Symmetry: D2
Subunit: 257 residues, 4 copies
């Protein structure tokens, strides 16, 4: 496959519905060797199974809120892999209040700090911590959402962080690209995943896009996973600092009229 | 003038070179009644003079890092003004390292947190704290920079925060617009101000834009001030959620070739 | 007012509902001296009345499809005015089929050619033809629509031309800006005007934006007019190559969900 | 490969340096069956050789300026292929004057009409003409340039048409997407090809981007070709209405400072 010999660290694989699960299947399929992270001791067993399913014995803890774990993630990885060709950042969080109802109502300095810390800062933080071992055709990929570009009901504080995240893709690409390292994002259309629970009326968004996207259908983690593999691969070697919509075209229309 | 009877609170007036100084002159000129904030007891005397020059006796402390001061700002303002028609947010900060040299080199969780806290979170925080007294044609305005849209040397962490800030304009506009309140940003071209010191090779940017902008000239705080007054006024009553470039057109070209 | 002594040529004033009618009122109000164009001998009497109402005796024919009339417009104008400080381009046309139903169905090379000829090419054509008499702080303004940015039902071929139109603003701004001439566009929200008749289900769009814009209300020609005056004035002297949304913020949201 | 069994019509293969040559190599490599077009009888022999090299005996004339040839292209294609899974539109033209020096200087109604006719209208024209035989996972791809987004020296009139072209991708995607057909564009960075001759100081652009792109290097037709294959393939099944930058990240930065 077009990822033969590529060694790719994936984060955010929490369930088989996860976007990262999709990216993993697509990568493994194309010849990639994978490793995975998890948050807390209580998820260690699940990700070990997941990693086994992709033929991997490489799982490592990493609460991205904690500098020590970030630094130790690559300290550990270093002992198994010589270098890294791919980093998937499929992580986010915002306090429930902050992604529910009115934007101002769920706004506190703490909520803001947390959403940005976890969803935005973590991407270039991992990149910095990975830099020593990154190869010269290495490739970083994060996940964004249209809520960064335009205001979307309930997405609120998360929208702001996603804006910062997408800017981080551009600054990262300039900072790492001299080393041959590419940095990109996929702005995925809505997918029913665990994190999607914290979005009030996700179902409404889901129906709206199935009704209004140009392809008249929602995207699957297989579709996003396929695009991710591409971006992670040398097929996308001319592509960096890009935010790629994989949302059946929804971003490009004014629907509902 | 087209701001007769409008009561406008301005922040970030630090010197006569400040962007907020420009906005104040333009507003006062158009009939507006002004009030101003400052950071710390040691700047109290300077802003009192400044306010005097605009015929105002209304100065209030506000380190936007501190919830208590934010809440007390409008508590104080309430005792003088019944309501507020205009809020200027002309505030930012990033640790010097974080806006110097390579993006990753100046990156720490703390730097990130601070830049975003001060430059991004503060705009909707002030809006939330102002909400009780805001009028029904009230108008909020913040200042952004092109570095939010594309990667610009040295702007680094500040670029990310400005992205979040611009997203905050859009979410703010949806949250406040039912009340008739408009929210906008001006993305100003480079102006030699005090904060511009912390930008390595500001002079290079300044020369580049004077050479490459369509109008072949840099913008002045008078030009930005004039645009701000407009946005703050009922002339811009159909305009909200907008990021307006006032940069002699620089954003719209690919210069240097 | 902030347009004292400015001499501004307006096009596209067809009725009192026209966007150009709004711009004219706002301009005249601010101290501007106006002149107007019309299409065909059979509209000569109506625009002469309109011009009278703005205290002007300056009406000139111009079907922008015809080179001769364009060239003769400024030949005539030259005999009355020494120079021109403002040009309003509030003109568009597309064959009815091309702005109705499915995009491909109403598509013919001729429809395409016509929509682009009239709605796009005419703006820089008039600019070229006006160049000799343009002053050194002169200002050109055209009208666009969100359909240029994203696909909107029925807007079809017109969306493509508007995209070209907005690009023309940018190239115009680089071409004219060394002479100190600014070029901008307003992307107005939907307004019931005569040209809006040719849009199937304009009423649906109108209801949608009143329900979904951040300000929850449609824009008036007074609101657009006010913004146009600003852009035409020296208040906007730092602003060129800009496409300014005056649409109650509609562009910035994903509504309907 | 990931294009096994896909039948793809390519246009614009003029030399081995052509962007379409790159796309063809990548497609053939991935298991695609190809066909090609050419302009005029005097290029028939060259494209027949080219097609041979990709193991194809399918060459067809098509000056996209002519309705008859467009209609006859798919009339002919129908006799060999039952249906079409991929259409590559790698075509453009503008009169030399219109892409040289000052924008206004090279501007005539005719130059405008021609550039738009050939570079913009032809894409949805071919799509309309192909519609009858298009499959249910078919995929259309055109080539754009950054000059559509921002003003670039010398690119002039071509910039306007490219803007219209990119809009066409969006309207096409809504029009064809209910049939399951995806439409996308690649905005490629500068590549020394035959058409690049008509760009004054192409060499200056080329040096600028090699010096200023995040990856510090120019893109090859292999890199664009690889991306095109992806977009044409079912790997990109969740992607439509997208304009994908393959330019080593150049679009995303403000270089030269
Ligand atoms: N679900 C959608 O519709 C959708 C659409 C567009 C983008 N996204 C984005 O896709 C990405 C992946 O989320 P998902 O939808 O696949 O849902 P998910 O619940 O499967 O994945 C979220 C992951 O974030 C991880 N996470 C949260 N806090 C963390 C921390 N402090 N440290 C490390 N990891 C942490 C969780 O462990 C989890 O695995 C997110 O960035 C999300 O914002 C999701
Ligand atoms: N100078 C430029 O070239 C330029 C260009 C585009 C945008 N901007 C933006 O314009 C805005 C105004 O900055 P300026 O250029 O006029 O420079 P400035 O130094 O005059 O103003 C900066 C202000 O930020 C205030 N500030 C910093 N930390 C604060 C805090 N914790 N609480 C309250 N206030 C705080 C300072 O007191 C100061 O008045 C900023 O948001 C800046 O990012 C500046
Ligand atoms: N009403 C809306 O919602 C809306 C929204 C966005 C942009 N616009 C734009 O505003 C302008 C006019 O809109 P309107 O709603 O006021 O419609 P309108 O019909 O009232 O005005 C358009 C004018 O263009 C004129 N015109 C047509 N063909 C011409 C030609 N060959 N030469 C010269 N003039 C010609 C018309 O006669 C009329 O004078 C156009 O730029 C249009 O694209 C309108
Ligand atoms: N080289 C670059 O830097 C660059 C960058 C961005 C986009 N593009 C685009 O890629 C495509 C081709 O670029 P190129 O550099 O390979 O140049 P090219 O000359 O090698 O290829 C262009 C093709 O269009 C053909 N063509 C011209 N007029 C035609 C007509 N009336 N009907 C059918 N075909 C016609 C040409 O003959 C040629 O086959 C175009 O879409 C062009 O706009 C090129
Ligand atoms: C509405 C589409 C969507 C976007 C996300 O970024 C997303 O991921 C989130 C959302 C809120 C909090 N945390 C995460 C990871 C989930 C979603 F369902
Ligand atoms: C380079 C142009 C520019 C942009 C700013 O946001 C700016 O304001 C800054 C920059 C860095 C840190 N803090 C502030 C307020 C100063 C500038 F000079
Ligand atoms: C749907 C909003 C809208 C946009 C226009 O450009 C407009 O002006 C047009 C539209 C179609 C053809 N011609 C003109 C002048 C009218 C409108 F109602
Ligand atoms: C400057 C980059 C560039 C863009 C093109 O669309 C391009 O293709 C063109 C350009 C002008 C006219 N015709 C074509 C096909 C060539 C180029 F070199």
């Amino acid at each position: 496959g077009f990822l033969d010999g590529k060694r790719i660290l994936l984060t955010g694989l929490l369930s088989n519905r996860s976007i990262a699960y999709g990216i993993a299947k697509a990568c493994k399929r194309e010849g990639a060797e994978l490793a995975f992270t998890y948050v807390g001791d209580r998820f260690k067993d699940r990700i070990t199974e997941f990693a086994a399913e992709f033929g991997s014995e490489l799982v490592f803890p990493c609460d991205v809120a904690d500098d020590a774990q970030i630094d130790a993630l690559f300290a550990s990885l270093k002992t198994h892999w010589d270098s890294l060709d791919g980093l998937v950042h499929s992580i986010g969080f915002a306090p429930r209040e902050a992604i529910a109802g009115d934007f101002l109502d769920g706004l506190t300095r703490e909520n803001f700090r947390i959403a940005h810390d976890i969803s935005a800062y973590s991407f270039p933080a991992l990149a910095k911590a990975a830099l020593p071992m990154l190869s010269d055709d290495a490739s970083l990929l994060t996940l964004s959402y249209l809520g960064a570009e335009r205001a979307i009901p309930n997405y609120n504080t998360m929208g702001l962080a996603k804006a910062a995240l997408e800017a981080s893709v551009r600054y990262l690409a300039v900072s790492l690209g001299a080393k041959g390292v590419r940095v990109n994002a996929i702005s995925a259309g809505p997918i029913k995943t665990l994190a999607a629970s914290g979005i009030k009326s996700f179902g409404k968004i889901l129906d709206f896009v199935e009704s209004n996207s140009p392809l008249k259908r929602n995207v699957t983690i297989e579709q996003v996973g396929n695009a991710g593999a591409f971006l992670l691969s040398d097929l996308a070697s001319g592509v960096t600092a890009e935010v790629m919509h994989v949302d059946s075209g929804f971003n490009a229309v004014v629907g509902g009229m």
